[PDB]
Amino acid sequence: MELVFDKDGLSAYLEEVFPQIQGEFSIDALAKGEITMRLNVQERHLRPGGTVSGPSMFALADVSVYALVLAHLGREALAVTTNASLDFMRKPESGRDLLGQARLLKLGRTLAVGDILLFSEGMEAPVARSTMTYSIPP
Amino acid sequence: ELVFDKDGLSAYLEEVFPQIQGEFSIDALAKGEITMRLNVQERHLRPGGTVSGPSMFALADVSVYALVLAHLGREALAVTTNASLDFMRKPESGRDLLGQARLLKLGRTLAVGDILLFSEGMEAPVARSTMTYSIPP
């Protein structure tokens, strides 16, 4: 499993793939089995003293592992979320970006599985973890 | 025993979630079951669009959270600790999503509920989910 995409290309293709969510998600780092996606909490426009929601944390987890699955499979690969689990461990720090450190554990003929830790930037103890499973059609 | 009624609960959710807005409404509330609707008009999706994974997540979470509040009242500050979602079928574009949630445990410190998500009109569920929340003192 070597990448068929670089950080810049994949960021471009993601904006093409899902243009609805423009300026919410950005790649900090990309590597053969690892990605760090960033959720820009300025885009959320929460009231002061507010924190990223459960759904936005889901979104971050889902986009990170999906980006990584695409990273290897390419533009053709039509991968689909089949399962998602999320454990919510610590309240995120208000006003801080959320970072998703995602690794790919399986990329098989029919099924990919990645997991992910989520951090409020600056805080080293993770706010959440998640596993995401996808199916890969023909 | 429930401490909220459908409108009491619907009201308290608008209060607590003004972000929710016109997104979620309660079709039915009973002692251990709730049917919550995700009003897909409020999504303002492209034609041929379907409720996203995060939105299904949100429906599952609010449904079980509502049912927890339905029994515990304002007092309980219940917090989501675990969520899982299985995505089984593609929702039918243009329909509301319905969430049939049942509370399986309402403990001193932990609540568990699961949920079947349906595209309105389609009988086979599109997703299912379990949600666990911890209850402070």
Place this chain on the structure above:
Amino acid sequence: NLYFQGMELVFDKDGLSAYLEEVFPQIQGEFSIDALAKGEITMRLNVQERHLRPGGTVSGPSMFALADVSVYALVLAHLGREALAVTTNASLDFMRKPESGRDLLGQARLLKLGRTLAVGDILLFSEGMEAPVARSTMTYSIPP
């Protein structure tokens, strides 16, 4: 009460009981089918076969075992002999301590039976106690 595509059984209860003891000789004595319907199965774990000390209760691995055998059996009830469902995911929530000295019942339902993936869920009960001790979701890969 629930609809899914692929509801038809190709086994009856006794033919399924027989096929499970064939494919799994270890299950004979521990797991038996109480009921089988198009959407649903009730499987029994015979608590005596576990030879637990008095006051002792069924383990998490054993509950896992019950939850997984139940949904697997329902998938096979629909797909037949030449179908090789492989477990890909399992989740389990433990809600109450099983009642010591009683069989454990798993009431599974099949929520999906697709081309490549089968999904089902299950509530575990100490027989005769109405509050479920546990709940689970099992998912299986169906290959060619």
Place this chain on the structure above:
Amino acid sequence: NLYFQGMELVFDKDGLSAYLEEVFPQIQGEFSIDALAKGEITMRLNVQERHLRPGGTVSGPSMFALADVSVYALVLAHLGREALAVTTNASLDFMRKPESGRDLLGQARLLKLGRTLAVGDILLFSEGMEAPVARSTMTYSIPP
């Protein structure tokens, strides 16, 4: 070197082994601790103790067994004797078949040790095989 609040161990490796064999007499011969650190444990499942048939591999409930005793052992390593961690949720993803005739290793890490809840995750390998056979998350309730 992942960070979490409450990293200090109150047991050392041999000490924790003693305590686990004491509190789980059935575990003796099956599970052993290869390594303990503040944030991680390696537990071994002794494949010989399963007396598996030819070319047969470790069952899912045994893999659940390893994942639960690994994370539970690591939580005990921090909270000590007087603490009663009680499993509340478990998830497992099965990714590859184990290698037949090799022990199974669970490399667990602790992600949270709170007032009421503890969370850890684990990767399962056939020993000497780089690709992990299974991943799991375990959550435990801590009473007062």
